[PDB]
């Protein structure tokens, strides 16, 4: 009736999502063109040339190599509906003092659906990245998809578990020093370590020890890490500060299941990592009949919009891809399972 | 019929189906009706 | 030693398919004539016909 109500801007309700893995470790992305995905790592280990004088020249050296692994398939496609009969009403947007034709509304809902599909692809990719640099072994499985296992090549020394009689839980809260444990866990890292990303609750017991008081732990301690945290804001990552030569990053990212939230990280884990650790953000090939017509066989993403014939005419929108996140060297991280 | 090809020797047609699983087909259509004007002009001897 | 994209294989398959369809059409066009001037009678019979 006679209301004449004007509407201001509406909320967004973005729950929580801050990858920090597709932006700190997987900066390199290369597409696929073949069925197999080789990944070699030459075992560089050279000896010395101690004393031999230029009269009795002797032993020669050996060439090296001998690593190869294939990580083939990947796939994902979150199809959405167009809702051909939902455009006759008005959206929560489109203020009631300036309406629009029910054609532009279809374009708006299509854009929203594409953005939702992109968010879904990102959340699928982040789970792959979390498994990748959390265990060195990934399993892609689900309904209507046979399981595929990717064994990164991680050694058993980089999967230390606290299980025993010394974990942390039965130490003193005021006198014990855990820095020696950090050094012991970081010695077998095969590279310098400066980020030790914790869990949102695994940071509670770490701060319990009084040895952390002498550490800086200030909001302005770094430049690169602080800048990346500013990039990846959204109240899912809290950079605590320095711990000596290593920074503290609390990553509380969340991903949505069918209807519920779940944490990317387990309850009590820590990861000894490197800020420059190279990781592959590589992409598969679109095995779609329509895609091959335009020669878009190799692409990071592939949007597609089509319409079905018949008495009820319905449009659709889909985004196909094949994320197969990878690392050059799995042994650049140490995954310690706290307890 | 929409392009007036009611009478032709062959007819190629390539078409792709909609839906999430997409597939494209190609088909050749014709109607050979080989006829002999004078049947008796030949003698088919079945040798043995 | 010189691969190709998985797109070009689609056209190779497409032209090979056209060749096979044309060959099959030309082959079915010949049994008619063979039966015609071999017996004087012919039968178009088969499943779904």
Curated annotation (Swiss-Prot), chain A:
Entry keyword set: Capsid protein, Host cytoplasm, Late protein, T=7 icosahedral capsid protein, Virion
Pfam families, per database record: Phage_cap_E (PF03864)
GO cellular component, one term: viral capsid
Top-rank taxon, per record: Viruses
Quaternary context: Homomultimer. Interacts with FI protein.
Signal peptide residue numbers: none
Record-given protein name: Major capsid protein
Localization, UniProt: Virion; Host cytoplasm
Physiological role: Assembles to form an icosahedral capsid with a T=7 symmetry. The icosahedral capsid is about 60 nm in diameter and composed of 415 major capsid proteins. The assembly is primed by the interaction between capsid assembly protease and portal dodecamer, and major capsid proteins assemble cooperatively to form the procapsid with the help of capsid scaffolding protein. Major capsid protein forms hexons and pentons of the icosahedron. Viral genomic DNA is packaged into the procapsid through the portal vertex.
């Amino acid at each position: 009736m006679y209301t004449t109500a004007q509407l201001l801007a509406a909320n967004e309700q973005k729950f929580k999502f801050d990858p920090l893995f597709l932006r700190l470790f997987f900066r390199e992305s290369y597409p696929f063109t073949t069925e197999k995905v080789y990944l070699s790592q030459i075992p560089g280990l050279v000896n010395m040339a101690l004393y031999v004088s230029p009269i009795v020249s002797g032993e020669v050296i050996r060439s090296r190599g001998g690593s190869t692994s294939e990580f083939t398939p990947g796939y994902v496609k979150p199809k959405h509906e167009v809702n051909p009969q939902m455009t006759l009403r008005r959206l929560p947007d489109e203020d009631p003092q300036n309406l629009a034709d029910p054609a532009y509304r279809r374009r708006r809902i299509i854009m929203q659906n594409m953005r939702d599909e992109e968010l879904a692809i990102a959340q699928v990719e982040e789970m792959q990245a979390v498994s990748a640099v959390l265990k060195g072994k990934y399993t892609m499985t689900g309904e209507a998809f046979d399981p595929v296992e990717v064994d990164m090549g991680r050694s058993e020394e980089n999967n230390i578990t606290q299980s025993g009689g010394t974990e942390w839980s039965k130490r003193d809260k005021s006198t014990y020093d855990p820095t020696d444990d950090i050094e012991a866990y970081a010695l077998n890292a095969s590279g310098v370590v400066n980020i030790i990303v914790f869990d949102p609750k695994g940071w509670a017991l770490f701060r319990s020890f009084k040895a952390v008081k002498e550490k800086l732990d200030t909001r302005r301690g770094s430049n690169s890490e602080l800048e990346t945290a500013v990039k990846d804001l959204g109240k899912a990552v809290s950079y605590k500060g320095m711990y000596g030569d290593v920074a503290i990053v609390v990553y509380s990212g969340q991903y949505v299941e069918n209807g519920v939230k779940k944490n990317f990280l387990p309850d009590n884990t820590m990861v000894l990592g490197n800020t420059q650790a190279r990781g592959l953000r590589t992409y598969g090939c679109i095995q779609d009949a329509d895609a091959q017509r335009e020669g878009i066989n190799a692409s990071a993403r592939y949007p597609k919009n089509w319409v079905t014939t018949g008495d009820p005419a319905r449009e659709f929108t889909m985004i196909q891809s094949a994320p197969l996140m990878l690392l050059a060297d799995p042994d650049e991280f140490v995954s310690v399972q706290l307890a």
